């Protein structure tokens, strides 16, 4: 088998690639779609809730780690939850020792340093979770996408998960407006992106979507079926 | 033989430099062999290419066979590694030998092959000492497409055997658009579509993937109820392709 | 039988560990060395022949003393022999520290054999490719022992391991007698070296060491040359 | 289809004109599978 | 490799359309052959 | 092809070469191109950062780290590996400051980080750092130095060198440039134009140019090129590339 | 494949090493335990010593404490190890809580020990099955069976080792409420269950009986012949 | 197959590495011990005495462990030395803790527990050594125990382990009168067994290693048969054999 | 027969450790060559310098280092391995100075570093540092010493030695020179070393392609031959 | 060639799937069916005993166990793996009652149990822990400050709020039935009748006292496991 070079992250392909790292990257394409946008003073996290069956509650994809910083997971539940606990402990340590919120850039830097260790050394499997990171600090909102390859990007928007390319193209097309939106307009663009990644026979219902919004004076709050009702009440109809 | 491959270089798209190299490596010396013997050197007795699977290596071979009206033989690469000890100077020599009488001819090696482990050694020894024992006028040429550049035998990649080397790169963006266009000219597709957007949505896609995109787009254009004149079908086709099966896998957040 | 010649912690279905036998084969390919126990003392000899006379023969020694009365010689790898020398010196000094008495050669051989076998306990570490010859004199009796990579240790009236060890052993059993004297013991050891030496032993080509009631002493090159001239 | 045939044969064995659910259970026990799964799993 | 150098120089000769060879042609041919050797 | 010997970084080949290190070499060669040049009174750095999607903010994946207040950091290869290497280099510099009480010389820092990346090369339970990085500094009593350290662990001193898919091309294009005389002002323009020519537009387009330098012009402090100097360098690149 | 790895699930969700260890018990020797109203008995098939082995140290039935006993089947050395650990834990539990160890607690400890020995590589599972018998200090008859997998179960009368299936069916067809009315009836039941597989009778049979808190005495080789004689007398009585 | 590290189980349930450790003892020197009415002995074969072994020794196969303990070894020399050292260690530890010589059963169980631990877990090759412990206690007088590389053990009155051990033990059980053998009869039986089980028409005293344990006057004395003593014993047996054959 | 060349700790049949010889070949893989010669009271090491382009800083491409103030060193093979080896040697020398209160002799330093290499080659937890070592120095009551260490842990004293791709030919030339039984004064030692390199390479090198280090009894400090002195030596040799 | 990614839990498939975790998931299909339904009046848990021998003591087979008086459990998978999971659940419940002196919600219970799970691929296992995924699926039901609550735990460590979830050898069929027979305001009595109907429809053997263990939790009473007579009363209606 010519693919004996993908069994652990400690071997390089003869073409200079770590195939296991690439597999971890592709693992988050198996999770549900999720997009996030940012204005002058507000960052939003809207994720497509998925349910194992219609008889059970939908899987939560927006996780609150601190009042000023919140994350959205897309990938393996175990690694996403472990990373969430690590961020919560890091933020608590920061609040205890420095009495200031951890800057989002520093938090994502620590995330990358933590998830690089499985990438480099034998043992722990690489963290196969794509994370959308949205918070507030001195330089305004940021949205950070932590790839499973321990690489992260500072992005105006991003979509990770299943059928995320359509949402990414939607954000590229509507690029020219995201900066100057208020809460409603940016939430609307995010919901339109999530509708774009959603197929025709499905639509963004209250149980299907979850919204997480952070801002200058508004803490990172997660919204649910009743709480997303006002945000969907102004929604335009699907352009079908 | 498939003697009529029916190509006019309008089938291959995005490989302009590659086909120019192929022409200048095979047919240009074929017709100016006189200018070659004026230099007192021998013409290249075989071209080589390499690249990711599905990037059009076989299509360019067929195109060259069409433009030169030369006999085509689709010798396999992984098939030869099996068939016991004997797939050296019993099939390779068989492939070369009687091709030289219906000889407007272009014999064609394909996916890389391995260029206990002793059968492949014999295969490549037969290859080198049979291709090196070539024809003076070189009325029959070899084109030796592969799949990777990782495994290379210097005895083959030297001059004579396989010196003319053509890299097949992944279609970038506009090459993706060109492939989409080429594979969609036989369907009654309206100008309402936007091939450029589909091209910028074809990242990581490689050649035959775009052909599958076109085919699936047509299939769902039928699925929508034979609703001809549609681009949304091209969009959904770009989403599904090889990954059309949707896992629905649990324990993923 | 192949799948069991790769680990030190797996028994071959028929016999025993094969890596031990392979280390012993490495031992058999080393420089020839002999050791002879005389009535009053013990002598051990080995050849220092190496190409490129550029090599400084005085720099390294194949015959080293463990304590005032114990000497050792190897047949196999050099660096493993050096490590064995260091370990044996450490064990001898520990025994001296705890008992305040020079270490009897038998106890030293047991401890050094345990040290060599402790490298055969687990995989990931290889057994020493070196077989030792231990010479010693205590309790009015000269002792000669051989330590093995397997950790087995046994005594020897007169033996010769390394390259061409079988012919050396045949010669020794055809020559050795229990009533031998120290000088004739050295002569026999030198002749045993000579018969397979291939290149006319010089004063420095061979290295010998003697041990008796007066402790163990590696012979200086002058005495080696004198013994060679006497043997001729 | 072989399981159904074996259920029919099992019904024939007891000389019954109608095959019962027990016959199908025994037929699927015979054909399919051509304590371990009952003592550690539960 | 050296015969390859010579043949590749002959090939270089017709890239710039000569009926002969030049010294810089031999240099670039041996350079390409050396890179292929690597 | 070296099959059977390249599965670990502690196994040699019959030719006597560790193929994992060569595969890290190849990984670096298949990455973006970054160059650095050491002027009369300092060093400057240049990176061809490819913006993979317009969705990314400008300055995302900052490839020019600053290990110490006076030490530059230009990397190429894997961004995660590069960040880990920058972090361990920062830790090493901080430890040197805490133990010795003064700034770490660039040669000593390069030696220590090369020792570390080598220590990650000869094990079997770990994998060599698949990134090549640059080190630059300027000291009034020591001078200016530049160092390139690759996954092989080697740390040679280069007058001004490049790493990436445009290794040889940038070597040829930097050879004709005479280097030893001018200062940062008359070398930033050159770095910009070299980076703008080595980059290929027909394939692998959509790149942005970022520069950093250290020297007495900034009081021996590594920092990004100021916006005005960055834009005048871009204008020089545009006029020179015509 | 999926067989040579203790902590690897097969595609059909089987830990095949654990099942192989479980099956290694079937290669042992038959041991049946029955609990009655006031008695619990341990019947095992004793291997016939050829000419020289000392039966005093071929112990198959061993007492963990004064209130618990057990018979194993499947591997003598692993059995000895688990026996020593079980008595050490019984003494430690009596040290911690000062009351005698109930059968449930010691059975749970044995099962947990075997489990923790079958959850990591480099630790071969304990290839024995144990039949824990005894009375709690309140005086209740409890019998437990521990599996090499690390699980335990409550049985009124179970058999382990080779031929355990046949003895199981025998007990299913012959375990009745009146069959345990008296101690002699339980003894008759367990002897009949043993003779179902070890048909020679007399020798090759070892019985240990536990009444209410008496420090059980294993039936010595003077009444086992008497008990089998009574069994034969009843056997010719009903037929 | 399932012949990997010892911590593996064959589908049929066999521990193949342990089985190979079992069968490996057949390559070791033959040693046997017999229980007599008023004494016990260990008879062992010196399989390797070529010409030039110093014989600076008390016994190679037989190893004394305690003032009441002695055993014979059969297996790899390294594991032999390690097991003997551990035997001495545990015996002296019991003596220190309890101020009493360790019982044979307790010491044998300790060593067998160690051996089982070497095959239970850890990825370590089991000790390929089989032992024959000889000793006395107030609990059971004279006892003989035969160890096992698997970590098992058994109380025996007559047992042979090593090469040709099967035939030796078969004829021994065919020719053992339990409860009516003294030291002299046991010695003669051991000599006859070694004669029938070794590949020599006339075995020499050098190839034979015999140690006798006897309790007398309050204390237990462990002595190996001296060269003169063993020579006298073998010559007495050869004249007994000559008498038997001339009578036949 | 074969297949035993995978692990350093595996003994092949006929007792041959392949991986050690593979490291020995990795020594030649460096592509360079060095020689060392010892006189009555001097010891000269000289190594070849290859510079692919003027772009490198020639002052930092040195292949010979300084272990202590009076003990020099030169190595060939994998250069990163060489730098790790000199770092370990410096550590060992200073630690010896601390522990025993006097400068480390060349023989003992080579012995200890060879012990380190043997420990590396004994356990399968290391790659055995595939770079050769050559040390020179002066010891009282003995004079100059030249000592060579290899990844196998083998060390020996040399009247004159070599390392690199041209090991065999350089050793043969040194044999031819040594069998003439000549005193080898300092200038003539340097001359013989330079002639050895030139004949074994057949290049008649320019003075800029060589670095030389010498240790003498009158100058126990390990002095690296600067450009002026090497120019003098080799131009005088060319004219002589 | 899925085999190279089969061995070991720390290996990623080309599709990014954790194959060993998937096998642990499928190992649930070897456990007896367990059905739990969420109602406003409480939650009921019904299981299949799968009695191997009539001689076996039924009380030993613990398909339903008590983590705390306010919470119930149902299990399907390896008995050993569960036993450890149940012990950890009880220990964590008592830890919460010690530190905060309050009855911890069933969501936090399943959170902690999942925390013990999903730890197979972690370096904290040096003192000793599971190097393989837990092969038991957990059905948690009880009453808390949010009223009655039912949670199903996935061997990978995933938990979800389920109004009616069925696990075991017959998860698919029982879940499909519960899909159409479940209704939001369904009363506890009719919920238990529905659960027993599904179990009868899906059981291999007939329905009796010894084939099912039944548990119920309602806001008023504590955890109650249906005794023999209660089982007869609830099974005579069906
Ligand atoms: N540039 C291109 N233009 C049009 N079609 C292409 C192009 N590249 C690949 N294809 C399609 O891919 C297929 C050929 O794949 P190819 O790479 O030649 O096969 P292989 O990789 O197996 O040798 C053809 O169906 C062809 O239509």
Looking up residue J39, the CATH number of its domain turns out to be 3.60.20.10
- Dihedral sign of CA atoms B29, B34, B35, B37 in order: positive
Q: D40–G23: do the CB atoms touch at under 8 Å?
A: no
Closest residue by Cα to residue I47 from I166, I139, I219: I166
Other C-beta atoms lying within 10 Å of the C-beta of residue H11? 13
Per DSSP, chain C holds a count of helices (H) and strands (E) of 6, 11
Q: What is the largest CA-CA distance in chain E?
A: 30
Question: CA B108, CA B5: separation in Å to the nearest integer?
Answer: 13
- Dihedral sign of CA atoms H168, H171, H173, H175 in order: negative
Task: Please give the C-alpha separations between residue F237 and each of F36, F174, F232, in angstroms, as whole numbers.
Answer: 16, 15, 9
Residues on chain A touching F53 (C-beta within 8 angstroms): 168, 172
DSSP SS3 for B5: coil
DSSP SS3 for I93: helix
DSSP SS3 for H106: helix
* DSSP conformation class of H222: E
* DSSP conformation class of I4: -
Element (H, E) at B217: helix B208-223
Residue A78 phi/psi, 5° resolution? -60, -50
Question: CA C46, CA C197: separation in Å to the nearest integer?
Answer: 10
Question: Could you tell me which residues come within 8 angstroms of residue I187 by beta carbon, excluding any fewer than 6 positions away?
Answer: I233, I236
Question: CA J214, CA J191: separation in Å to the nearest integer?
Answer: 12
Structural domain span for residue H222: 1-246
Domain CATH code at residue G202? 3.60.20.10
Kind of pairing, strands C158-161 and C33-37? antiparallel
- Dihedral sign of CA atoms A124, A129, A134, A138 in order: positive
Q: H helices within H76-216, ranges in order?
A: 77-98, 104-120, 165-174, 183-197
Q: E4–B38: do the CB atoms touch at under 8 Å?
A: no
Question: CA A7, CA I31: separation in Å to the nearest integer?
Answer: 34
Ligand 1 centre to CA of B239 (Å) is 20
DSSP SS3 for E4: helix
Cβ G194 vs Cβ G45: under 8 Å: yes
Residues on chain I touching C64 (C-beta within 8 angstroms): none
Task: Please give the C-alpha separations between residue H143 and each of G10, H105, H214, in angstroms, as whole numbers.
Answer: 49, 9, 11
- Dihedral sign of CA atoms C166, C168, C171, C177 in order: negative
Structural domain span for residue J71: 6-238
- How many independent structural domains does chain C possess? 1
Cβ H84 vs Cβ H128: under 8 Å: no
* Ligand 1 atom at minimum distance from B110 CA: 23
- How many independent structural domains does chain A possess? 1
| Extended beta strands in I69-198, E state | 71-77, 131-139, 143-149, 155-158, 160-164
Residue G153 CA, chain-centre distance (Å), reads 12
Return the best residue to mutate from B56, B63, B144, B168 for the ligand 1 pocket (most ligand atoms within 8 A of CB).
B56
Structural domain span for residue G201: 1-239
CB contact burial I44-62 (16+ within 10 A = b; e otherwise): bbbbbeeeeeebbbeeeee
Q: Which residues pair with I69 in a beta bridge?
A: none
Cβ J201 vs Cβ J193: under 8 Å: no
Cβ F138 vs Cβ F214: under 8 Å: yes
Question: Could you tell me which residues come within 8 angstroms of residue A15 by beta carbon, excluding any fewer than 6 positions away?
Answer: B148, B150, F23, F26, F30
Domain CATH code at residue H178? 3.60.20.10
Domain CATH code at residue A64? 3.60.20.10
- CB-CB: which of B35, B41, B159 is closest to E4? B159
Closest residue by Cα to residue G119 from G95, G98, G149, G147: G149
Question: CA I202, CA I199: separation in Å to the nearest integer?
Answer: 5
Q: H13–G20: do the CB atoms touch at under 8 Å?
A: yes
Question: CA J174, CA H164: separation in Å to the nearest integer?
Answer: 66
Cβ J8 vs Cβ J20: under 8 Å: yes
For the segment(s) F1-240, the CATH number from 3.60.20.10, 3.10.450.30, 3.30.200.20, 3.40.50.300 is 3.60.20.10
The experimental technique used to determine this model is cryo-EM
| Extended beta strands in chain C, E state | 33-37, 42-47, 55-56, 63-65, 70-76, 130-138, 141-147, 153-155, 158-161, 206-212, 215-218
Strand arrangement, sheet containing I143-149: C55-56, I155-158, I143-149, I131-139, I71-77, I64-68
Q: J31–D40: do the CB atoms touch at under 8 Å?
A: no
Cβ A36 vs Cβ A45: under 8 Å: yes
Task: Please give the C-alpha separations between residue J17 and each of D31, I50, J159, in angstroms, as whole numbers.
Answer: 33, 50, 19
Closest residue by Cα to residue A207 from J160, J150, J165: J160
- How many independent structural domains does chain H possess? 1
Question: CA J94, CA G192: separation in Å to the nearest integer?
Answer: 49
- How many independent structural domains does chain J possess? 1
Question: CA C145, CA C43: separation in Å to the nearest integer?
Answer: 12
Task: Please tell me what resolution, in angstroms, this structure has.
Answer: 3.0
Question: CA G33, CA G160: separation in Å to the nearest integer?
Answer: 9
Residue J127, Cβ density class (10 Å: 0-12 exposed, 13-18 middle, ≥19 buried): exposed
Question: Could you tell me which residues come within 8 angstroms of residue B235 by beta carbon, excluding any fewer than 6 positions away?
Answer: A166, B198, B201
Cβ H160 vs Cβ H49: under 8 Å: no
Residues on chain F touching A14 (C-beta within 8 angstroms): 1-2, 6, 19, 23, 26
Question: CA H209, CA H211: separation in Å to the nearest integer?
Answer: 7
Which residues of chain H are at the C interface, by a Cβ-Cβ cutoff of 8 Å? 3-6, 16-17, 20-21, 23-24, 27, 51-57, 76-78, 81-82, 85, 123-126, 128
Task: Please give the C-alpha separations between residue E19 and each of A73, B42, B206, E4, E15, in angstroms, as whole numbers.
Answer: 67, 13, 41, 19, 11
Other C-beta atoms lying within 10 Å of the C-beta of residue I179? 10
| Extended beta strands in chain A, E state | 34-38, 42-48, 62-64, 69-75, 129-137, 140-146, 152-154, 158-160, 209-215, 221-223
Question: Which string of DSSP letters, residue by residue, matches B46-98?
Answer: -EEEE-STTSSHHHHHHHHHHHHT-EEEE--SSTTT-SSTTSSTTTHHHHHHG
CB contact burial F117-154 (16+ within 10 A = b; e otherwise): bbebbbbbebbbbbbbbbbbbbbeeeebbbbbbbbbbb
Give the HSE-up count for residue C21: Cα atoms under 13 Å, Cβ half-sphere.
11
Question: CA A125, CA A129: separation in Å to the nearest integer?
Answer: 11
Residues on chain B touching E20 (C-beta within 8 angstroms): 39
Q: What is the largest CA-CA distance in chain G?
A: 58
* DSSP conformation class of C15: S
Cβ G40 vs Cβ G208: under 8 Å: no
Cβ H105 vs Cβ H173: under 8 Å: no
Cβ I76 vs Cβ I34: under 8 Å: yes
Question: Could you tell me which residues come within 8 angstroms of residue C188 by beta carbon, excluding any fewer than 6 positions away?
Answer: C36, C158, C172, C175, C176, C180
Element (H, E) at J65: strand J64-68
Structural domain span for residue A48: 3-236
Kind of pairing, strands J64-68 and B71-74? unpaired
Question: CA I226, CA I236: separation in Å to the nearest integer?
Answer: 15
Residue I235, Cβ density class (10 Å: 0-12 exposed, 13-18 middle, ≥19 buried): exposed
Question: CA F199, CA I21: separation in Å to the nearest integer?
Answer: 44
Kind of pairing, strands F42-50 and F207-215? antiparallel
DSSP SS3 for B152: coil
- CB-CB: which of A16, A122, A155 is closest to F125? A122
Please state the three-class secondary structure of chain G as a single string. Answer: CCCCCCCCCCCCCCCHHHHHHHHHHHHCCCEEEEECCCCEEEEEECCCCCCCCCHHHCCCEEEEECCEEEEEECCHHHHHHHHHHHHHHHHHHHHHHCCCCCHHHHHHHHHHHHHHHCCCCCECCCCCEEEEEEECCCCCEEEEEECCCCCEEEECEEEECCCHHHHHHHHHHHCCCHHHCCHHHHHHHHHHHHHCCCCCCCCCEEEEEECCCCCCCECCCCCHHHHHHHHHHHHHHHC
Cβ D35 vs Cβ J52: under 8 Å: yes
Q: B252–A14: do the CB atoms touch at under 8 Å?
A: no
* DSSP conformation class of A11: -
Other C-beta atoms lying within 10 Å of the C-beta of residue B214? 22
Question: CA C208, CA C193: separation in Å to the nearest integer?
Answer: 10
Instruction: Using CA atoms of F172, F176, F182, F188 in order, give the dihedral in degrees to the nearest 10.
Output: -50
For residue B56, say whether it is annotated as part of any ligand binding site.
Answer: yes
For the segment(s) I1-240, the CATH number from 3.60.20.10, 3.90.550.10, 3.30.300.160, 3.40.1080.10 is 3.60.20.10
Q: F60–A171: do the CB atoms touch at under 8 Å?
A: no
Closest residue by Cα to residue D19 from D5, D39, D31: D5
Question: CA G185, CA A216: separation in Å to the nearest integer?
Answer: 84
Task: Please give the C-alpha separations between residue G228 and each of G99, G191, G194, in angstroms, as whole numbers.
Answer: 38, 8, 11
Question: Could you tell me which residues come within 8 angstroms of residue B66 by beta carbon, excluding any fewer than 6 positions away?
Answer: B4, B5, B6, B7, B8
Residue J128, Cβ density class (10 Å: 0-12 exposed, 13-18 middle, ≥19 buried): exposed
Task: Please give the C-alpha separations between residue C73 and each of A115, B157, C22, C200, in angstroms, as whole numbers.
Answer: 54, 55, 20, 21
* DSSP conformation class of E20: S
Closest residue by Cα to residue G15 from D41, J168, J153: D41
Question: CA C160, CA H50: separation in Å to the nearest integer?
Answer: 14
Question: CA I139, CA I120: separation in Å to the nearest integer?
Answer: 29
- Dihedral sign of CA atoms B133, B137, B139, B145 in order: positive
Which protein residues are within 6 Å of ligand 1, measured from CB? B 12-15, 53-59, 110-111, 145, 179, 182-183, 207-208, 211
Question: CA B106, CA B108: separation in Å to the nearest integer?
Answer: 6
Question: Could you tell me which residues come within 8 angstroms of residue A200 by beta carbon, excluding any fewer than 6 positions away?
Answer: A240
Other C-beta atoms lying within 10 Å of the C-beta of residue H58? 9
Reduced DSSP (H G I as helix, E B as strand, rest coil) percent helix, strand, coil of chain J, to 5: 40, 25, 40
Closest residue by Cα to residue J112 from J127, J126, J99, J123: J99
Ligand 1 centre to CA of B214 (Å) is 13
Strand arrangement, sheet containing A152-154: A62-64, A69-75, A129-137, A140-146, A152-154
Cβ C149 vs Cβ C24: under 8 Å: yes
Residues on chain B touching A201 (C-beta within 8 angstroms): none
């Amino acid at each position: 088998f010519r693919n004996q070079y993908d069994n652990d992250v400690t071997v390089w392909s003869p073409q200079g690639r770590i195939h296991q790292i690439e597999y971890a990257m592709e693992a988050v394409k198996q999770g549900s779609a999720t997009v996030g946008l940012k204005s002058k003073t507000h960052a939003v996290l809207v994720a497509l809730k998925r349910a194992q069956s219609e008889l059970a509650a939908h899987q939560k994809k927006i996780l609150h780690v601190d009042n000023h910083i919140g994350i959205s997971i897309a990938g393996l539940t175990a690694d996403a939850r472990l990373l969430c606990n690590f961020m919560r402990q890091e933020c608590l340590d920061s609040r205890f020792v420095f009495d200031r919120p951890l800057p989002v850039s520093r938090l994502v830097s620590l995330i990358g340093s933590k998830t690089q260790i499985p990438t480099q050394r034998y043992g722990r499997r690489p963290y196969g979770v794509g994370l959308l990171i949205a918070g507030y600090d001195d330089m305004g909102p940021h949205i950070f996408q932590t790839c499973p390859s321990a690489n992260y990007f500072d992005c105006r928007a991003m979509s990770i998960g299943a059928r995320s390319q359509s949402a990414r193209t939607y954000l590229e097309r509507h690029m020219s407006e995201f900066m100057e939106c208020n809460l409603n307009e940016l939430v609307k663009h995010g919901l339109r992106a999530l509708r774009e990644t959603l197929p025709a026979e499905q639509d963004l219902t209250t149980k299907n979507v979850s919204i997480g919004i952070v801002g200058k004076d508004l803490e990172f709050t997660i919204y649910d079926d009743d709480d997303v009702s006002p945000f969907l009440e102004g929604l335009e109809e699907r352009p079908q | 033989v498939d003697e009529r491959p029916t190509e006019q270089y309008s089938d291959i798209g995005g490989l302009d430099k590659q086909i120019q190299e192929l022409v200048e490596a095979i047919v240009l010396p074929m017709n100016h062999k006189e200018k070659f013997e004026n230099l007192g050197i021998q013409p290249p007795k075989g071209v080589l290419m390499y690249g990711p699977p599905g990037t059009g290596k076989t299509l360019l071979a067929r195109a060259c066979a069409a433009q030169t009206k030369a006999t085509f033989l689709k010798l396999a690469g992984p098939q030869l590694v099996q068939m016991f000890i004997g797939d050296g100077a019993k099939l390779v020599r068989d492939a070369f030998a009687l091709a030289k009488e219906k000889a407007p001819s272009i014999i064609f090696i394909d996916e890389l092959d391995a260029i206990g482990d002793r059968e492949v050694q014999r295969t490549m020894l037969e290859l080198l000492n049979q291709l090196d024992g070539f024809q003076p006028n070189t009325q029959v040429k070899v084109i030796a497409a592969t799949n990777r550049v990782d495994i290379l035998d210097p005895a083959l990649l030297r001059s004579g055997r396989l010196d003319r080397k053509i890299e097949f790169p992944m279609p970038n963006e506009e090459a993706r658009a060109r492939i989409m266009q080429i594979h969609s000219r036989k369907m009654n597709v309206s100008p309402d579509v936007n091939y450029e957007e589909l091209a910028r949505c074809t990242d990581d896609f490689n050649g035959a993937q775009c052909k599958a995109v076109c085919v699936e787009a047509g299939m769902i254009a039928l699925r929508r109820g034979a609703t001809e004149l549609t681009h949304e079908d091209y969009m959904e086709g770009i989403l599904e392709v090889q990954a059309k099966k949707k896992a629905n896998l649990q324990y993923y957040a | 039988e192949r799948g069991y010649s790769f680990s030190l912690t797996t028994f071959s279905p028929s016999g025993k560990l094969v890596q031990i036998e392979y280390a012993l084969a490495a031992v058999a390919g080393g420089a020839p060395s002999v050791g002879i126990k005389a009535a009053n003392g013990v002598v051990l000899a080995t050849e220092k022949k190496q190409k490129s006379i550029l090599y400084d023969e005085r720099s390294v020694h194949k015959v080293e003393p463990i304590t005032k009365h114990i000497g050792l010689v190897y047949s196999g790898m050099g660096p493993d022999y050096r490590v064995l020398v260091h370990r044996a010196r450490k064990l001898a000094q520990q025994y001296y520290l705890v008992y305040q008495e020079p270490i009897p050669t038998a106890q030293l051989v047991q401890r050094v054999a345990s040290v060599m076998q402790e490298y055969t306990q687990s995989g990931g570490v290889r057994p020493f490719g070196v077989s030792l010859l231990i010479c010693g004199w205590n309790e009015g009796r000269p002792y000669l022992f051989q330590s093995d990579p397997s950790g087995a240790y046994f005594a020897w009236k007169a033996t010769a391991m390394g390259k061409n060890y079988v012919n050396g052993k045949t010669f020794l059993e055809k020559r050795y007698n229990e009533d031998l004297e120290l000088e004739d013991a050295i002569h026999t050891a030198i002749l045993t070296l000579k018969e397979s030496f291939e290149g006319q032993m010089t004063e420095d080509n061979i290295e010998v060491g003697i041990c008796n009631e007066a402790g163990f002493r590696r012979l200086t090159p002058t005495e080696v040359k004198d013994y060679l001239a006497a043997i001729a | 289809r072989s399981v159904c045939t074996e259920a029919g044969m099992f019904a024939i064995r007891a000389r019954r004109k109608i095959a019962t659910e027990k016959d199908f259970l025994e037929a699927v026990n015979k054909v399919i599978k051509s304590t371990p799964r009952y003592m550690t799993y539960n | 490799d050296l015969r390859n150098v010579c043949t590749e120089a002959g090939m270089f000769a017709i890239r710039a359309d000569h009926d002969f060879v030049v010294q810089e042609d031999f240099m670039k041919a041996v350079r390409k052959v050396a890179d292929s050797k690597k | 092809i070296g099959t059977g010997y390249d599965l670990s970084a502690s196994t040699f080949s019959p030719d006597g070469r560790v193929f994992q290190v060569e595969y890290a070499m190849k990984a670096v060669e298949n990455s973006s191109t970054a160059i650095g040049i050491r002027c009369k009174d300092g060093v400057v750095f240049g990176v061809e950062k490819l913006v993979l999607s317009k969705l990314y903010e400008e300055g995302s994946n900052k490839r020019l780290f600053n290990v110490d207040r006076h030490v530059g950091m230009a990397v190429a290869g894997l961004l995660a590996d590069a960040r880990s290497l920058a972090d361990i280099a920062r830790e090493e510099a901080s430890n040197f400051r805490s133990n010795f009480g003064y700034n770490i010389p660039l040669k000593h820092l390069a030696d220590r980080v090369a020792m570390y990346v080598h220590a990650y090369t000869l094990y079997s339970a770990v994998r060599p750092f698949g990134c090549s990085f640059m080190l630059g500094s300027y000291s009034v009593n020591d001078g200016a130095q530049l160092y390139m350290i690759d996954p092989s662990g080697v740390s040679y001193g280069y007058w001004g060198c490049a790493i990436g898919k445009a290794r040889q091309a940038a070597k040829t294009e930097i050879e004709k440039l005479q280097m030893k005389e001018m200062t940062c002002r008359d070398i930033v323009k050159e770095v910009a134009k070299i980076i703008y020519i080595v980059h290929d537009e027909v394939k692998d387009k959509a790149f942005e140019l970022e520069l950093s330098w250290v020297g007495e012009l900034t009081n021996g402090r590594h920092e990004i090129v100021p916006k005005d100097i960055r834009e005048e360098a871009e204008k020089y690149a545009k006029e020179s590339l015509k | 494949s999926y067989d040579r790895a203790i902590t690897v699930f097969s595609p059909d969700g089987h830990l095949f090493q654990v099942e192989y260890a479980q099956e290694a018990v079937k290669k042992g020797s038959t041991a049946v335990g029955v609990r009655g109203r006031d008695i619990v008995v341990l019947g095992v098939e004793k291997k016939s010593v050829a000419k020289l082995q000392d039966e005093r140290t071929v112990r198959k039935i061993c007492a963990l404490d004064d209130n618990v006993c057990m018979a194993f089947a499947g591997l003598t050395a692993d059995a000895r190890i688990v026996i020593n650990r079980a008595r050490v834990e019984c003494q430690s539990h009596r040290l911690t809580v000062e009351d005698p160890v109930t059968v449930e607690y010691i059975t749970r400890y044995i099962a947990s020990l075997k489990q923790r020995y079958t959850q990591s590589n480099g630790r071969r599972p304990f290839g024995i099955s144990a039949l824990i018998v005894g009375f709690d200090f309140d005086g209740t008859p409890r019998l437990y069976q521990t599996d090499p997998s690390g699980t335990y179960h409550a049985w009124k009368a179970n058999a382990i080792g080779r031929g355990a299936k046949s003895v199981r069916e025998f007990l299913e067809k012959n375990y009745t409420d009146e069959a345990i009315e008296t101690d002699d009836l339980t003894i008759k039941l367990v002897i009949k269950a043993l003779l179902e597989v070890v048909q020679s009778g007399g020798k090759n049979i070892e019985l240990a009986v536990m009444r209410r808190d008496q420090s059980l005495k294993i039936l010595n080789p003077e009444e086992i012949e008497k008990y089998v004689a009574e069994i034969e007398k009843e056997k010719e009585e009903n037929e | 197959r399932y012949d990997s590290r010892t911590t593996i189980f064959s589908p049929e349930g066999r521990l193949y590495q342990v089985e190979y450790a079992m069968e490996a003892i057949g390559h070791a020197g033959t040693c046997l011990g017999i229980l007599a009415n008023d004494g016990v002995l260990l008879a062992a074969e010196r399989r390797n005495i070529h010409k030039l072994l110093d014989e600076v020794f008390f016994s190679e196969k037989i190893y004394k462990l305690n003032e009441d303990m002695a055993c014979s070894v059969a297996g790899i020399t390294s594991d032999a030395n390690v097991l003997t050292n551990e035997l001495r260690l545990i015996a002296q530890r019991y003596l220190l803790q309890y101020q009493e010589p360790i019982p044979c059963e307790q010491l044998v169980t300790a060593l067998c527990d160690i051996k089982q631990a070497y095959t239970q877990f850890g990825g370590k090759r089991p000790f390929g050594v089989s032992l024959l412990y000889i000793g006395w206690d107030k609990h059971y007088g004279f006892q003989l125990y035969q160890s096992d590389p698997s970590g098992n053990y058994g109380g025996w009155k007559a047992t042979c382990i090593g090469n040709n051990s099967a035939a030796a033990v078969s004829m021994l059980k065919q020719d053992y009168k339990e409860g009516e053998m003294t030291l002299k009869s046991a010695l003669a039986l051991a000599i006859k067994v070694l004669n029938k089980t070794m590949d020599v028409s006339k075995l020499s005293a050098e190839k034979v290693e015999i140690a006798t344990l006897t309790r007398e006057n309050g204390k237990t004395v462990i002595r190996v048969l001296k060269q003169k003593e063993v020579e006298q014993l073998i010559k007495k047996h050869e004249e007994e054999e000559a008498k038997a054959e001339r009578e036949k | 027969s074969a297949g035993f060349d995978r692990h350093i700790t595996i003994f092949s049949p006929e007792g041959r450790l392949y991986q050690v010889e593979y490291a020995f070949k990795a020594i030649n893989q460096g592509g360079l060559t060095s020689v060392a010669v010892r006189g009555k009271d001097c010891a000269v090491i000289v190594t070849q310098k290859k510079v692919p382009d003027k772009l490198l800083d020639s002052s930092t491409v040195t292949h010979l280092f300084k272990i202590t103030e009076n003990i020099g060193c030169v190595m060939t093979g994998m250069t990163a391995d060489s730098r790790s080896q000199v770092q370990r040697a410096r550590y060992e020398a200073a630690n010896w100075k601390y522990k025993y209160g006097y400068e480390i002799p060349v023989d003992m330093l080579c012995k200890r570093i060879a012990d380190i290499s043997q420990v590396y080659t004994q356990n399968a937890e290391m790659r055995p540092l595939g770079c050769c070592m050559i040390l020179i120095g002066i010891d009282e009551e003995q004079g100059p010493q030249v000592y060579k260490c290899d990844p196998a842990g083998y060390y020996c004293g040399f009247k004159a030695t070599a390392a690199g791709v041209k090991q065999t030919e350089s050793t043969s030339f040194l044999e031819k020179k040594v069998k003439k039984k000549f005193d080898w004064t300092f200038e003539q030692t340097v001359e013989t070393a330079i002639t050895c390199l030139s004949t074994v390479l057949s290049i008649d090198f320019k003075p800029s392609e060589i670095e030389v280090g010498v240790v003498t009894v009158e100058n126990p400090k390990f002095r690296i031959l600067t450009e002026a002195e090497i120019d003098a030596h080799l131009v005088a040799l060319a004219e002589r | 060639t899925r085999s190279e990614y089969d061995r070991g839990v720390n290996t990623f498939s080309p599709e990014g799937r954790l194959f060993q975790v998937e096998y642990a998931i499928e190992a649930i299909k070897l456990g007896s069916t367990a059905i739990g339904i969420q109602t406003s009046e409480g939650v009921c848990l019904a299981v299949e005993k799968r009695i191997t021998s009539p001689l076996m003591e039924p009380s030993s087979i613990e398909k339903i166990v008590e983590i705390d008086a306010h919470i119930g459990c149902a299990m399907s998978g390896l008995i050993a793996d569960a036993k450890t999971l149940i012990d950890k659940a009880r220990v964590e419940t008592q830890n919460h009652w010690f530190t905060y002196n309050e009855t911890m919600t069933v969501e936090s219970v399943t959170q902690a149990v999942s925390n013990l799970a999903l730890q197979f691929g972690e370096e904290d296992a040096d003192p000793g822990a599971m190097s393989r995924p837990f092969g038991v699926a957990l059905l948690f039901g009880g009453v808390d400050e949010k009223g009655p609550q039912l949670f199903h735990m996935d061997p990978s460590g995933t938990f979800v709020q389920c109004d009616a979830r069925a696990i075991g050898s017959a998860s698919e069929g029982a879940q499909s039935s519960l899909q159409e027979v479940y209704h939001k305001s369904m009363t506890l009595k009719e919920a238990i009748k529905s659960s027993l109907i599904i179990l009868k429809q899906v059981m291999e053997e007939k329905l009796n006292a010894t084939n099912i263990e039944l548990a119920t939790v309602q806001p008023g009473q504590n955890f109650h496991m249906f005794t023999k007579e209660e089982l007869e009363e609830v099974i005579k209606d069906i």
